[PDB]
Amino acid sequence: SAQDLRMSYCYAKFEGGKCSSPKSRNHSKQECCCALKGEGWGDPCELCPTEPDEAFRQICPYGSGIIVGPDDSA
């Protein structure tokens, strides 16, 4: 589904320099800014894109959903 199905740490907040709120478990960079829609992704947090940015959809073909964080909310 994703690129090299890389599943690292997804951060919920990216301080245009660092990150915070990393999910104990790891998910695909797509599952991070798509289903988890955080602020950054990967151990080396990388600022995730936002819709409808070409990059945004680059991880979410259908949109913020795909595999909405299973048993990871509600």
Side-chain angles (χ1 to χ4, degrees):
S1 188
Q3 58 233 73
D4 180 39
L5 224 302
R6 264 246 189 96
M7 1 156 308
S8 277
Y9 304 114
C10 179
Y11 300 71
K13 37 201 352 202
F14 178 69
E15 247 296 290
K18 83 205 105 213
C19 241
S20 243
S21 211
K23 328 314 315 161
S24 282
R25 294 267 258 292
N26 20 283
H27 309 238
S28 331
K29 80 126 150 168
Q30 318 227 138
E31 179 162 15
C32 176
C33 358
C34 291
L36 305 163
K37 312 114 84 242
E39 270 243 9
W41 171 81
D43 108 60
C45 223
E46 324 198 19
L47 181 275
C48 273
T50 27
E51 85 185 285
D53 187 13
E54 178 140 288
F56 172 84
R57 88 94 196 193
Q58 206 158 87
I59 35 185
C60 344
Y62 347 133
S64 45
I66 302 160
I67 33 70
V68 21
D71 179 18
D72 215 299
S73 38

